[PDB]
């Protein structure tokens, strides 16, 4: 019953986060802060895919007859590249001397951003092969972890600066994504409970963070 309970907890946070995010879109922004709204729009698009998966899950769990963990990959293969792009946009926001927008970043860096998303795709493909038992768990863990490390290395060396604001955002995200790999080791129920709660942290906490940064930047404009 704890897969269902953790799914409901995840859905609860998704709904409240979506409401917060929509109000966030309409907060007026100073010039330098425009990219924060570009990030929040993409986080809301991630939420649409996440929500469709979670409604599918709670309906499916009524009559589970097979191990449905692999179905998460149809969400992740869409959401995780968008989340890596929004992370790049947020690092560029933090670290850039004057105003920066996603078009400037995309137009400049599309090849490198492709590399990041291709590394991430290989991580997911290896996970999917392990989840569907087309390769053994040990090969899945080692190959998946290799591409997780490559993704986060490529992100670090291009987009971070050496300060504690950067270390918090980078290492929080790295640890949370690593813990999806940790979950892979566990039996059906425990693994799926872990994913249900991890999604709150990887997706919804990120949205709430961006909302609070917008509110902080814009508070004086609002009042």
Numbering used by the authors: 2 to 224
Sentences from the paper on this structure:
Here we present the results of a comprehensive structure-function study of two homologous proteins (61% sequence similarity) from the VR1 group, OLPVR1 (ADX06642.1), and VirChR1 (TARA-146-SRF-0.22-3-C376786_1). VirChR1s have proteorhodopsin-like architecture with short extracellular loops and share several structural features, such as membrane-associated ICL2 helix and an unconventional TM6-TM7 orientation.
Here, we present a high-resolution structure of another VR1 protein, OLPVR1, at 1.4 Å resolution. OLPVR1 molecules are nearly identical in both structures (root mean square deviation (RMSD) less than 0.2 Å), so hereafter, we refer to the structure from type A crystals as it has the highest resolution. The OLPVR1 protein (residues 2–223), all-trans retinal (ATR) covalently bound to K204 (K257 in CrChR28), 9 lipid molecules, and 107 water molecules are clearly resolved in the electron density maps. 2Fo–Fc electron density maps at 1.4 Å reveal two alternative conformations of the retinal in the region of the β-ionone ring. Strikingly different from other rhodopsins, the intracellular parts of TM6 and TM7 helices of OLPVR1 are significantly moved apart from each other far enough to form a pore. The pore is located at about 8 Å from the cytoplasmic side of the lipid membrane border and connects the inside of the protein with the groove on its surface, which leads further to the intracellular bulk. Surprisingly, in our structure, the groove and a part of the pore are occupied with a fragment of the lipid molecule, a host lipid of the crystallization matrix (MP and MO in case of 1.4 and 1.6 Å structures, respectively), which is likely to be a crystallization artifact and is discussed in more details in the Supplementary Notes.
